Ligand binder design. Structure first.
Ligand SMILES: OC[C@H]1O[C@@H](O[C@H]2[C@H](O)[C@@H](O)[C@H](O)O[C@@H]2CO)[C@H](O)[C@@H](O)[C@H]1O
Ligand SMILES: OC[C@H]1O[C@@H](O[C@H]2[C@H](O)[C@@H](O)[C@H](O)O[C@@H]2CO)[C@H](O)[C@@H](O)[C@H]1O
Ligand SMILES: OC[C@H]1O[C@@H](O[C@H]2[C@H](O)[C@@H](O)[C@H](O)O[C@@H]2CO)[C@H](O)[C@@H](O)[C@H]1O
Ligand SMILES: OC[C@H]1O[C@@H](O[C@H]2[C@H](O)[C@@H](O)[C@H](O)O[C@@H]2CO)[C@H](O)[C@@H](O)[C@H]1O
Ligand SMILES: OC[C@H]1O[C@@H](O[C@H]2[C@H](O)[C@@H](O)[C@H](O)O[C@@H]2CO)[C@H](O)[C@@H](O)[C@H]1O
Lengths: 103, 226, 103, 103, 103, 103
């Protein structure tokens, strides 16, 4: 398996790595029908989303979508710095595929 | 309880994550890494601030003593505060660790390595025109269960953190001799004091994160997610 | 997809944005039959609920409702400031659809 | 829906409101067969339980029962003051129906 | 229902109460096949386990087992004192049935 | 059952003990399809993964893989030192089988 987020990011089409190196500015969570998602922003202006589960997702990603939302909430609440984000750029806001943090 | 007069108000202390040493914005900030040295800190006096340089924040053993110091240093402030702090192993009795080389012995200070996290502050009193408002405001985020049973770090754990310079006679004598950093008693001695001090701080900071970050841990229904 | 809570809120009929910018004052949780819900209030006196799951809830909303109650409990216990709420105003108390937090 | 715990409590038989206004003194958790439950006590002598799931619990309550035990564990750990409890008094110890916390 | 850990403990065979009154010294977690379990030890020397789900466990115990491991992880992290443990002593290490904490 | 991570580790083929005694340096989490995994590294230069669930994992391991991931996230966030790791050395990066922490 890959050993870094950059290496893992490279195996997919439509992805790109963002070096954030900063904490989350705002956290938005929604339980409205067909918009069950999370949106995060940074002071740099960047805005990213964890997509609503759908057909583009295989069954194994369902449990991972839930884990990712858990991680972003606690990362926001603890003001923990995010290092990099691997995102799919064929979505607006860009969709989160992986995240990394370093101390 | 330890006490410290300080012009920095409660909401600022809250923004910073605690009472910080000179030049340390936030308690968990690893970027603007500070220089830590007990001997240096204990000698350098400040104007407008009770001793808080060289990685340590000073405190007194009583409200009255904290008050006296505040009057001498913060005399021209219409308002200032005296924070009431719980004892814990990030605190070192300056007289005990530096022994007979303690520069200001009579003051009897107890310093906190790396600052004082907000959760270790019990409460505070406001001081108006130099007069103490005898009503203690209590901090809602003080961790009672955790700090309930903790104490100052014993002197034995501080000897290696004393920070005396390499050729300082103290490194050739009881009981500092048995605790001298590699290259003490060459910059290395100094660079080693900074290294050890940063290690002790990092471990204490982990204990604090274990307390405050755990409040955000949300348990998952694994069987339902699986 | 929406990029902010206001933008998401506007996609629904019977919603409205409440600018809270304050921490939750009280939290009520119930496991009583047919009323398994959560109610929160603020110093302003405003009161909101997370509804009991029902037929007005699409299957994808069921996991999002549980997540929202988890988020509200965490926020209450840690005195975290809530920035805005998107609520369905055709319920009493107003029903929560999305929440945002900042800084 | 009800706006306060007192309104909610009044909709059921054999319930009573206890004004606690204190943190939990002791927390007991059991995974022993047929006794999967949580018991809490207060300094004033009161003892309450979250019941072992059973025939009296409808499907919708199963999840809320698990949520209530999570709430009692985290409330104990953080030493959070509990304002009121709505309990069924036809069980010993009295069984928790709803919980309220404030400030 | 029982009102204390000692009452509850005595309802089963091969159980014993241990008064710990100390925090967990070490925490070991395993995801290895047939060894999915948690092992804890105390400064005093005692070692206990939450056992792997098996035929000796009733269904209602499946979820209680998961809750107990959650509780053990968070009390270890927060350095929270454990008061008493009710354990099955016909297992090596002794198996956890109930836990109690008080402050 | 085993009483220590070393004892448990030796019950499996292709495993080995690593004494880390250090906090996790970086944490990487991915929800990308076929790569739903976590990767951690230490200052020492060592990299470990929690594998993507597959056929080499028995049913009872599914719930344990999820728990391990929750444990690594909170251990990372709190900067808690990991003592030893039991890993499968026939995978690159080496795969985590068990973890132990002390103090
Ligand atoms: O999986 C989330 C991700 O999906 C991408 O869509 C992929 C899909 O994952 C893959 O299974 C399929 O074979 O190809 C699709 C691309 O054509 C989305 O493009 C991406 O935006 C995310 O939504
Ligand atoms: O989704 C919670 C929300 O539902 C609204 O009702 C909607 C329902 O979601 C939708 O599926 C249907 O097509 O239209 C309904 C209009 O009544 C409620 O109006 C709102 O208050 C919440 O309960
Ligand atoms: O819901 C927990 C609560 O249940 C009561 O039992 C109810 C039962 O839920 C309902 O189906 C039936 O029609 O009436 C019963 C009595 O009102 C228990 O009495 C109470 O103690 C709780 O266990
Ligand atoms: O519940 C865990 C507990 O089980 C005991 O074994 C019993 C079980 O409690 C009950 O179903 C019945 O008496 O038979 C089981 C044996 O198949 C264990 O002895 C005890 O060690 C725990 O494992
Ligand atoms: O369980 C994770 C672990 O699996 C090993 O595969 C074992 C497998 O667990 C066992 O059921 C089978 O009978 O033998 C396999 C060894 O040939 C993996 O080798 C190991 O790397 C982990 O993936």
């Amino acid at each position: 398996a890959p050993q870094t987020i950059t290496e893992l990011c490279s195996e997919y089409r439509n992805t790109q790595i963002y070096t954030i190196n900063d904490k989350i500015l705002s956290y938005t969570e929604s339980m409205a029908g067909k918009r069950e998602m999370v949106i995060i922003t940074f002071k740099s202006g960047e805005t990213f989303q964890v997509e609503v589960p759908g057909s583009q997702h295989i069954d194994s990603q369902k449990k991972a979508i839930e884990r990712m939302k858990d991680t972003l909430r606690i990362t926001y609440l603890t003001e923990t710095k995010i290092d990099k984000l691997c995102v799919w750029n064929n979505k607006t806001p860009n969709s989160i595929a992986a995240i990394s943090m370093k101390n | 309880r330890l006490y410290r007069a300080d012009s920095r108000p409660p909401d600022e202390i809250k923004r910073s994550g605690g009472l910080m040493p000179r030049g340390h914005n936030e308690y968990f900030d690893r970027g603007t890494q500070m220089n830590i040295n007990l001997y240096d800190h204990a000698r350098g006096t400040q104007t407008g601030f009770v001793r808080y340089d060289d990685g340590y924040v000073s405190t007194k053993l009583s409200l009255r003593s904290a008050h006296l110091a505040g009057q001498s240093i913060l005399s021209g402030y219409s308002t200032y505060y005296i924070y009431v702090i719980a004892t814990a192993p990030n605190m070192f009795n300056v007289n005990d660790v530096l022994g007979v080389y303690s520069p200001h012995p009579y003051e009897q200070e107890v310093s906190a390595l790396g600052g004082i996290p907000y959760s270790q502050i019990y409460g505070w009193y406001r001081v108006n025109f130099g007069v103490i408002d005898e009503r203690l405001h209590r901090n809602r985020e003080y961790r009672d269960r955790y700090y309930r049973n903790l104490n100052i770090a014993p002197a034995e754990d501080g000897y290696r953190l004393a920070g005396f310079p390499p050729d300082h006679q103290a490194w050739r004598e009881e009981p500092w001799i048995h605790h001298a950093p590699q290259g003490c008693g060459g910059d290395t001695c100094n660079e080693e004091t900074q290294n050890l001090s940063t290690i002790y701080l990092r471990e204490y900071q982990s204990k604090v994160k274990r307390q405050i970050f755990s409040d955000y841990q949300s348990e998952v229904d694994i069987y339902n997610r699986i």
